Design a binder for this molecule. Sequence first.
Ligand SMILES: *C(=C)C1=C(C)[C@@H](Cc2[nH]c(/C=C3N=C(/C=C4\NC(=O)[C@H](C)[C@H]4[C@@H](*)C)C(C)=C\3CCC(=O)O)c(CCC(=O)O)c2C)NC1=O
Ligand SMILES: *C(=C)C1=C(C)[C@@H](Cc2[nH]c(/C=C3N=C(/C=C4\NC(=O)[C@H](C)[C@H]4[C@@H](*)C)C(C)=C\3CCC(=O)O)c(CCC(=O)O)c2C)NC1=O
Ligand SMILES: *C(=C)C1=C(C)[C@@H](Cc2[nH]c(/C=C3N=C(/C=C4\NC(=O)[C@H](C)[C@H]4[C@@H](*)C)C(C)=C\3CCC(=O)O)c(CCC(=O)O)c2C)NC1=O
Ligand SMILES: *[C@@H](C)[C@H]1/C(=C/C2=NC(=C\c3[nH]c(C[C@H]4NC(=O)C(C=C)=C4C)c(C)c3CCC(=O)O)/C(CCC(=O)O)=C2C)NC(=O)[C@@H]1C
Ligand SMILES: *[C@@H](C)[C@H]1/C(=C/C2=NC(=C\c3[nH]c(C[C@H]4NC(=O)C(C=C)=C4C)c(C)c3CCC(=O)O)/C(CCC(=O)O)=C2C)NC(=O)[C@@H]1C
Ligand SMILES: *[C@@H](C)[C@H]1/C(=C/C2=NC(=C\c3[nH]c(C[C@H]4NC(=O)C(C=C)=C4C)c(C)c3CCC(=O)O)/C(CCC(=O)O)=C2C)NC(=O)[C@@H]1C
Ligand SMILES: *[C@H](C)[C@H]1/C(=C/C2=NC(=C\c3[nH]c(C[C@H]4NC(=O)C(C=C)=C4C)c(C)c3CCC(=O)O)/C(CCC(=O)O)=C2C)NC(=O)[C@@H]1C
Ligand SMILES: *[C@H](C)[C@H]1/C(=C/C2=NC(=C\c3[nH]c(C[C@H]4NC(=O)C(C=C)=C4C)c(C)c3CCC(=O)O)/C(CCC(=O)O)=C2C)NC(=O)[C@@H]1C
Ligand SMILES: *[C@H](C)[C@H]1/C(=C/C2=NC(=C\c3[nH]c(C[C@H]4NC(=O)C(C=C)=C4C)c(C)c3CCC(=O)O)/C(CCC(=O)O)=C2C)NC(=O)[C@@H]1C
Ligand SMILES: *[C@H](C)[C@H]1/C(=C/C2=NC(=C\c3[nH]c(C[C@H]4NC(=O)C(C=C)=C4C)c(C)c3CCC(=O)O)/C(CCC(=O)O)=C2C)NC(=O)[C@@H]1C
Ligand SMILES: *[C@H](C)[C@H]1/C(=C/C2=NC(=C\c3[nH]c(C[C@H]4NC(=O)C(C=C)=C4C)c(C)c3CCC(=O)O)/C(CCC(=O)O)=C2C)NC(=O)[C@@H]1C
Ligand SMILES: *[C@H](C)[C@H]1/C(=C/C2=NC(=C\c3[nH]c(C[C@H]4NC(=O)C(C=C)=C4C)c(C)c3CCC(=O)O)/C(CCC(=O)O)=C2C)NC(=O)[C@@H]1C
Ligand SMILES: *[C@H](C)[C@H]1/C(=C/C2=NC(=C\c3[nH]c(C[C@H]4NC(=O)C(C=C)=C4C)c(C)c3CCC(=O)O)/C(CCC(=O)O)=C2C)NC(=O)[C@@H]1C
Ligand SMILES: *[C@H](C)[C@H]1/C(=C/C2=NC(=C\c3[nH]c(C[C@H]4NC(=O)C(C=C)=C4C)c(C)c3CCC(=O)O)/C(CCC(=O)O)=C2C)NC(=O)[C@@H]1C
Lengths: 177, 177, 177, 164, 164, 164
Amino acid sequence: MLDAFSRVVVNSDAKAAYVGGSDLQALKSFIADGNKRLDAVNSIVSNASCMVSDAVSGMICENPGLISPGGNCYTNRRMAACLRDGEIILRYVSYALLAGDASVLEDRCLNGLKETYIALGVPTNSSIRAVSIMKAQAVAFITNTATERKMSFAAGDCTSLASEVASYFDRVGAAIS
Amino acid sequence: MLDAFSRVVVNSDAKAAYVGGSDLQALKSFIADGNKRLDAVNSIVSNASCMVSDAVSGMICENPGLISPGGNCYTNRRMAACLRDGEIILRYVSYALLAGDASVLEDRCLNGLKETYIALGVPTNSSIRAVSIMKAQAVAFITNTATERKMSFAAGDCTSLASEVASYFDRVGAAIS
Amino acid sequence: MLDAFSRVVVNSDAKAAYVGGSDLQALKSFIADGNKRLDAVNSIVSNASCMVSDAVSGMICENPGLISPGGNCYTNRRMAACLRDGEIILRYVSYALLAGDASVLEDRCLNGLKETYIALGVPTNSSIRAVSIMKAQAVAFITNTATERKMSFAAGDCTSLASEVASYFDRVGAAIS
Amino acid sequence: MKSVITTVVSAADAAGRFPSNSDLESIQGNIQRSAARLEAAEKLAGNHEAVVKEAGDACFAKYAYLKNPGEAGENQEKINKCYRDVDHYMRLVNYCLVVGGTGPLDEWGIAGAREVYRTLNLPTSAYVASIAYTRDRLCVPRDMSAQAGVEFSAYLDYLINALS
Amino acid sequence: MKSVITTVVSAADAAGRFPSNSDLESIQGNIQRSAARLEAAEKLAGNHEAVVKEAGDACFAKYAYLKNPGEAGENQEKINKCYRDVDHYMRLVNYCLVVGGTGPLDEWGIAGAREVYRTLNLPTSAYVASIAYTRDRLCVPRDMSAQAGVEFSAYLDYLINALS
Amino acid sequence: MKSVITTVVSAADAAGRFPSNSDLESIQGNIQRSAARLEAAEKLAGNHEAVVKEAGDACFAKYAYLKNPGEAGENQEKINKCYRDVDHYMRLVNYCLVVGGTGPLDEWGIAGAREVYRTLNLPTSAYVASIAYTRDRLCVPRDMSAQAGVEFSAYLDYLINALS
Ligand SMILES: *C(=C)C1=C(C)[C@@H](Cc2[nH]c(/C=C3N=C(/C=C4\NC(=O)[C@H](C)[C@H]4[C@@H](*)C)C(C)=C\3CCC(=O)O)c(CCC(=O)O)c2C)NC1=O
Ligand SMILES: *C(=C)C1=C(C)[C@@H](Cc2[nH]c(/C=C3N=C(/C=C4\NC(=O)[C@H](C)[C@H]4[C@@H](*)C)C(C)=C\3CCC(=O)O)c(CCC(=O)O)c2C)NC1=O
Ligand SMILES: *C(=C)C1=C(C)[C@@H](Cc2[nH]c(/C=C3N=C(/C=C4\NC(=O)[C@H](C)[C@H]4[C@@H](*)C)C(C)=C\3CCC(=O)O)c(CCC(=O)O)c2C)NC1=O
Ligand SMILES: *[C@@H](C)[C@H]1/C(=C/C2=NC(=C\c3[nH]c(C[C@H]4NC(=O)C(C=C)=C4C)c(C)c3CCC(=O)O)/C(CCC(=O)O)=C2C)NC(=O)[C@@H]1C
Ligand SMILES: *[C@@H](C)[C@H]1/C(=C/C2=NC(=C\c3[nH]c(C[C@H]4NC(=O)C(C=C)=C4C)c(C)c3CCC(=O)O)/C(CCC(=O)O)=C2C)NC(=O)[C@@H]1C
Ligand SMILES: *[C@@H](C)[C@H]1/C(=C/C2=NC(=C\c3[nH]c(C[C@H]4NC(=O)C(C=C)=C4C)c(C)c3CCC(=O)O)/C(CCC(=O)O)=C2C)NC(=O)[C@@H]1C
Ligand SMILES: *[C@H](C)[C@H]1/C(=C/C2=NC(=C\c3[nH]c(C[C@H]4NC(=O)C(C=C)=C4C)c(C)c3CCC(=O)O)/C(CCC(=O)O)=C2C)NC(=O)[C@@H]1C
Ligand SMILES: *[C@H](C)[C@H]1/C(=C/C2=NC(=C\c3[nH]c(C[C@H]4NC(=O)C(C=C)=C4C)c(C)c3CCC(=O)O)/C(CCC(=O)O)=C2C)NC(=O)[C@@H]1C
Ligand SMILES: *[C@H](C)[C@H]1/C(=C/C2=NC(=C\c3[nH]c(C[C@H]4NC(=O)C(C=C)=C4C)c(C)c3CCC(=O)O)/C(CCC(=O)O)=C2C)NC(=O)[C@@H]1C
Ligand SMILES: *[C@H](C)[C@H]1/C(=C/C2=NC(=C\c3[nH]c(C[C@H]4NC(=O)C(C=C)=C4C)c(C)c3CCC(=O)O)/C(CCC(=O)O)=C2C)NC(=O)[C@@H]1C
Ligand SMILES: *[C@H](C)[C@H]1/C(=C/C2=NC(=C\c3[nH]c(C[C@H]4NC(=O)C(C=C)=C4C)c(C)c3CCC(=O)O)/C(CCC(=O)O)=C2C)NC(=O)[C@@H]1C
Ligand SMILES: *[C@H](C)[C@H]1/C(=C/C2=NC(=C\c3[nH]c(C[C@H]4NC(=O)C(C=C)=C4C)c(C)c3CCC(=O)O)/C(CCC(=O)O)=C2C)NC(=O)[C@@H]1C
Ligand SMILES: *[C@H](C)[C@H]1/C(=C/C2=NC(=C\c3[nH]c(C[C@H]4NC(=O)C(C=C)=C4C)c(C)c3CCC(=O)O)/C(CCC(=O)O)=C2C)NC(=O)[C@@H]1C
Ligand SMILES: *[C@H](C)[C@H]1/C(=C/C2=NC(=C\c3[nH]c(C[C@H]4NC(=O)C(C=C)=C4C)c(C)c3CCC(=O)O)/C(CCC(=O)O)=C2C)NC(=O)[C@@H]1C
């Protein structure tokens, strides 16, 4: 896996180039905004259980066929696996946000997942809706605009971090579409 | 694996339905004819060695090229593997007859077998002839009409059980054709 | 694996034939020229390190892009793997020459190697040039015509052994082309 | 799916063996016990709606807090899911009686349940209240014969123990 | 296929090693012993029919019961298969002499034999009688030289021990 | 690629865990130490050619035998590869300073190095001479601040120890 810094390193190494002042402004800002990134990750991890629960429940209340017989969440064993996958995906999205790079998500979570869900009969479209709901939740928490819970922050702009986490959630559906 | 009873359960569960009187007549008869099923399985297991020996020998006396050089039963190692597969297939057919359902045969024996025999160069047509001979033997034993051995039974009609075991032997060739 | 003798055996067995005088002249000569074969293998094993080093270096001085960024020998880890593969291929070619048969090379080295190099991005054309250089080296050593080192032999004709080792080196490129 | 037959067949297969006498003798037990459990299954199939209603009512009677805001039974939709879940279990109990083993409960009702009920904040005691009510409501010989009762009760206790 | 060469190469490969001096020295043994075993192979190739006939006749001479109904040699077809099998073994013995190791016997004659002969009810003693007859019939130096005899006898004993 | 972030994330992933407080606190160390090592990286990026020249000159000054026939620096092409290699290392040192960990050295410079330098007959002492020269040539506060010096020196010592 790479993080924001080692991403730059990889790109520089492809040109046999040193990383110098001209190349570092983005990483100096990454550092200077690093407390906000830590807060954004805290805001997700601290609500992760409610996020996964509410997103998978939301997927099902919108498409109740998923819990009919033959539905892919029918039985406790299936519903538990689904909830388990929701938590795994959120976990990898949280690592990508902590690292400022998607590689951990793409490499360790998304690689092979489409073929797996195809093999198992896991509906990739319902999966994308669960992931979109968690996207909606995560942006709300990062910007402290969730309706049902607020947390504590020094006031400031976390637009970029919310856009970034959204991009990592969007990667999941891209991978499995 | 499923058995006759859990097959019904699976089919009912696909309709979220209880299994009631109307659904149970077939299983009450399965029970009421259960001693005959036990006898039919005994009649096969008690002659299993002679069945496999005689069937594989029969395959070869009909197609003696199988034991020429380059033939798939040439060498003791090959002949032993063939005899070994004959016994395995009969074993899984005997489990299907004990359970009143093919799932154990299909799942644990037939799944993947075609691709395997293709990969190894095992002739699937000669395999089907060995299996047809064991079918002929098994029907004879179940109905106590084998020419060279009779066993002991209270007299009665075991037509259905013979037709059923024939169907499980026919599954093997269907899978590997 | 087979050796020169068991190759003959395999071919005879395909015709259910005994190996007799008429069939043995080639193997009696194999035996009668066996000290030369031992010397030829010694001449390679005794220079194996310099051979691999010089061949892989030669591949690179002819195509220096291989050690640019993005090149397949760029980094110590890659260069070490390449050198490691050079030594492995020479090792299997040396076993084929000791045995008077290619089967060990084809079975244990060449089988699967194309698909592997394709999967990894290892350039098969640069690989073939490294192998051709080691071919050139091996023929020189076997015939005691290397420019930079001579070894000690009773004088005689080792043309056949050099042609034979060349054929085993040519198998590598055939497999990976 | 765990039953008499699948247990002995799986054991024989793990050992590479043909069915032998202890396997056929085990299956003779099927023939002997089947009438009792099939009697229970038919009674359940024929009356499950009334049974399910009584059991869900007992849950909410025992745990009125479930109807408070934020709790598991906070609205009618959620309440209806709770009675549906009880019905699901009763259906699985019918299936175990038919199969002669715990397989349908184990596979379709118990596997994953802890994770589901913990994650969705569904208190396990509410399920236990429904199933235990049903076990204790059983009236022999009013509702079925003594041995049909033993069979029905054994799967209810099995579920209660699986939840506890 | 087990020989001098394949043994030392397989060992070197298991260890990741180039051929080294003890491998070349082992193979020098090939050069030294080859004349004896190739003499045996040629004699066998040149006379196998008469050898096979004597050995199969000795089997049936020793075990006349084999010709009874239900026994392994109950008809002429079955009898002819028995002499064919002896010939197969003698062919494998020729191959071991040529290769300088037990590989052709091990792979093509011994692997699976126990299972075959047990399943087809072919008594192992009948095979042993044929091969031991041939071992004891060998006449040195009438039939071949002493060391060709040692080579030929060693593979016959190896087969007998493999069957016993 | 080993850094503060990738270490704590990999550990959390091995355990199936979300990031928790000790992971965020580790990453706070990034924020605190980054100025020192980024100062070293920028100084190196801005002056690597002069640094690399001094270090390669020190190698050949210390080991004039390298220029003899058959030795590693026997011609100008080979000499130029040696200074290129020093530059490669200095580039990897810049990358470690930027990443805040040894990952770029470990992956792109150290893994496989022993095998390469042994096989190509490149003496490890010549590399060590270049890197140790550079470590000892560092002049604080002439060239950078004390803590930028500590960061730069730590990766040079790490490479020296990796070669030794
Ligand atoms: C079925 C009837 C059904 C649902 C179940 C529900 C699913 C759903 N949820 C959202 C949006 C959010 N859910 C949030 C989760 C939480 N907020 C909290 O305070 C706790 C800690 C946690 C779990 C309950 C959050 C933060 C949001 C973001 C919006 C907000 O704060 O109000 C959606 C909207 C998704 C979208 O925008 O695409 C859905 C569908 N909805 C149901 O219909
Ligand atoms: C080669 C010359 C050759 C054979 C070998 C043989 C193969 C063969 N066998 C059958 C039919 C049966 N074999 C049976 C086996 C046995 N009967 C016994 O009493 C013992 C315990 C056991 C092993 C010898 C049985 C029961 C039958 C059923 C018929 C019967 O009882 O007579 C066939 C017929 C297969 C078919 O109908 O398709 C064949 C080909 N035949 C040979 O030609
Ligand atoms: C880059 C500038 C470059 C090379 C590096 C080099 C590669 C190369 N080498 C050969 C031929 C041989 N190399 C040999 C190796 C050795 N000789 C020794 O005495 C030691 C023990 C050992 C290692 C140095 C040998 C024996 C030969 C055979 C020819 C000879 O003896 O002179 C080639 C020629 C390959 C071919 O013919 O296709 C090449 C390209 N060449 C460089 O340009
Ligand atoms: C969007 C993400 C938020 C928001 C975030 C901000 N946080 C700011 C300052 C700040 N936050 C922390 C906590 C963080 N640092 C850590 O070391 C750890 C745990 C190890 C965490 C969780 C700290 C220490 C600081 C520094 C200031 C302080 O000591 O209080 C901040 C101020 C700007 C800045 O410092 O960059 C912002 C904007 N604020 C928002 O309003 C949204 C909701
Ligand atoms: C076709 C398969 C046969 C045949 C079978 C019949 N068997 C009958 C009765 C019967 N068989 C057994 C033995 C069986 N039960 C077991 O518990 C075990 C071992 C554990 C075995 C092998 C029993 C106990 C019975 C019950 C009667 C008794 O005690 O003897 C039967 C009678 C009808 C019925 O009971 O269903 C038949 C028809 N009969 C045939 O003629 C063919 C060849
Ligand atoms: C082409 C390969 C060579 C060459 C080879 C010849 N070698 C000859 C004789 C010979 N070589 C050895 C050493 C070999 N035998 C072994 O047992 C071992 C190690 C276990 C090795 C490495 C021996 C023992 C002999 C036998 C004669 C002696 O004792 O010295 C040879 C002579 C002909 C023959 O014996 O077949 C030749 C031609 N000669 C060449 O000029 C090229 C370069
Ligand atoms: C009744 C004693 C509870 C109660 C139950 C609720 N269950 C809710 C959802 C739910 N239930 C199950 C288990 C059920 N599904 C199956 O396939 C099987 C198989 C036997 C069983 C027992 C699952 C998997 C789910 C989630 C999927 C779905 O919604 O159906 C539920 C909705 C919870 C929510 O959305 O937050 C409730 C309210 N309610 C009560 O008050 C008591 C505690
Ligand atoms: C929930 C939103 C889905 C849903 C999910 C299901 N997933 C099931 C099985 C499953 N998922 C994965 C991938 C997961 N495991 C990993 O290790 C990683 C990343 C490291 C991920 C993302 C695997 C490998 C499996 C199979 C093994 C297992 O069951 O754990 C699953 C069970 C399928 C079945 O019935 O056998 C379900 C239901 N299902 C849905 O309907 C929504 C859309
Ligand atoms: C001779 C001492 C026996 C005897 C032999 C019979 N062998 C029969 C079949 C048979 N033999 C073999 C082993 C043979 N095949 C090979 O490929 C090799 C390789 C070295 C050898 C030794 C096999 C695999 C088979 C089965 C296939 C086939 O029929 O060829 C045979 C027929 C048995 C039957 O059909 O029931 C007989 C009679 N007969 C004797 O009286 C003594 C004991
Ligand atoms: C006999 C009637 C055939 C015949 C059969 C051969 N089968 C050979 C190998 C083989 N068979 C299987 C499948 C078998 N193993 C299982 O575990 C199961 C089910 C659980 C089954 C049905 C496997 C996996 C293999 C390969 C591994 C092995 O050798 O045991 C075989 C050897 C092929 C070879 O030469 O390598 C033969 C000869 N051959 C025939 O000619 C008749 C038609
Ligand atoms: C050198 C002349 C090539 C070159 C070679 C590379 N090979 C790399 C990896 C590699 N090679 C193999 C096959 C090898 N392993 C075996 O066990 C056997 C036979 C028994 C052989 C021939 C494998 C399986 C692998 C991958 C595992 C590993 O790295 O050891 C490699 C590394 C690729 C990477 O970057 O990950 C290289 C560079 N590269 C070249 O440019 C020249 C043409
Ligand atoms: C038992 C020792 C008592 C007794 C109990 C009564 N049960 C009453 C009604 C009743 N019970 C059930 C559940 C029951 N029916 C089933 O089909 C199954 C399982 C398959 C069970 C557990 C229901 C659904 C009903 C209502 C419908 C009906 O009347 O059958 C009952 C009526 C009064 C009441 O509701 O409390 C009593 C008194 N009766 C006895 O005499 C002994 C002492
Ligand atoms: C040996 C110490 C005795 C002796 C033995 C005799 N052998 C007789 C004939 C003979 N032997 C064999 C088998 C033999 N020939 C071979 O080619 C091979 C192996 C490759 C062997 C084991 C055969 C086939 C025959 C018949 C054909 C022939 O005559 O060569 C023999 C003739 C009389 C008889 O059949 O009993 C005898 C007496 N002879 C001796 O002088 C010493 C004492
Ligand atoms: C230090 C305690 C001494 C001292 C040392 C001097 N350094 C001299 C020149 C110099 N040093 C370097 C390498 C240095 N520059 C860098 O950018 C980096 C790392 C990023 C390092 C290690 C170079 C390339 C040069 C030449 C270019 C330049 O002048 O900066 C130097 C000049 C004389 C000489 O070449 O020997 C000295 C004397 N100077 C001090 O005052 C304290 C005592």
